[PDB]
Design a protein around this ligand. Structure first.
Ligand SMILES: *[C@@H]1O[C@H](CO)[C@@H](O)[C@H](O)[C@H]1NC(C)=O
Ligand SMILES: *[C@@H]1O[C@H](CO)[C@@H](O)[C@H](O)[C@H]1NC(C)=O
Length: 130
């Protein structure tokens, strides 16, 4: 059966338990110590596109040293709406979006407020009328 290689490591962070070989369907969780903030989706899933090679479904998140002064402006996604997240958006805070009725999403539904005062680590999702 297809399997995944070692999960992407994380500076100043930890990964939850995983057995080897890593079977397709395996999920691992990332976390950071108290003085750091996890940026990006915390859970990775081992998938396979061709049933021969296994690959993780997304890049690993990262741990950023807490910057207490950082804040992000209200993120806006045309055709979509915020379903989770409250202002003010400080370092490590996240917002989740859903597309309006008759719109379909492309991209990650959640973004995080980074130390550089920008939303990331990915672009905000796009909601397209279908
Ligand atoms: C972002 O979302 C896309 C589309 O769902 C996915 O393919 C990609 O792996 C995600 N990346 C991260 C860092 O979450
Ligand atoms: C949204 O409405 C349009 C027009 O009726 C239609 O083409 C599309 O399939 C609808 N989307 C969903 C998810 O029902």
């Amino acid at each position: 059966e297809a399997s995944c290689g070692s999960p992407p490591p994380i500076l100043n962070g930890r990964i939850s338990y995983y057995s080897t070989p890593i079977a397709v369907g395996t999920v691992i969780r990332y976390s950071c110590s108290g003085t750091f903030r996890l940026i990006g989706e915390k859970s990775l899933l081992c998938i396979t596109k061709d049933k021969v090679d296994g690959t993780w479904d997304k890049p690993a998140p990262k741990c950023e040293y807490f910057n207490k002064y950082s804040s992000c402006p209200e993120p806006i996604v045309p055709g979509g709406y915020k379903i989770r997240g409250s202002t003010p958006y400080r370092h490590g805070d996240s917002v989740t979006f859903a597309c309006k009725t008759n719109f379909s999403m492309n991209g990650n539904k959640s973004v995080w407020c980074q130390a550089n005062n920008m939303w990331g680590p990915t672009r905000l999702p796009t909601c397209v009328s279908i």
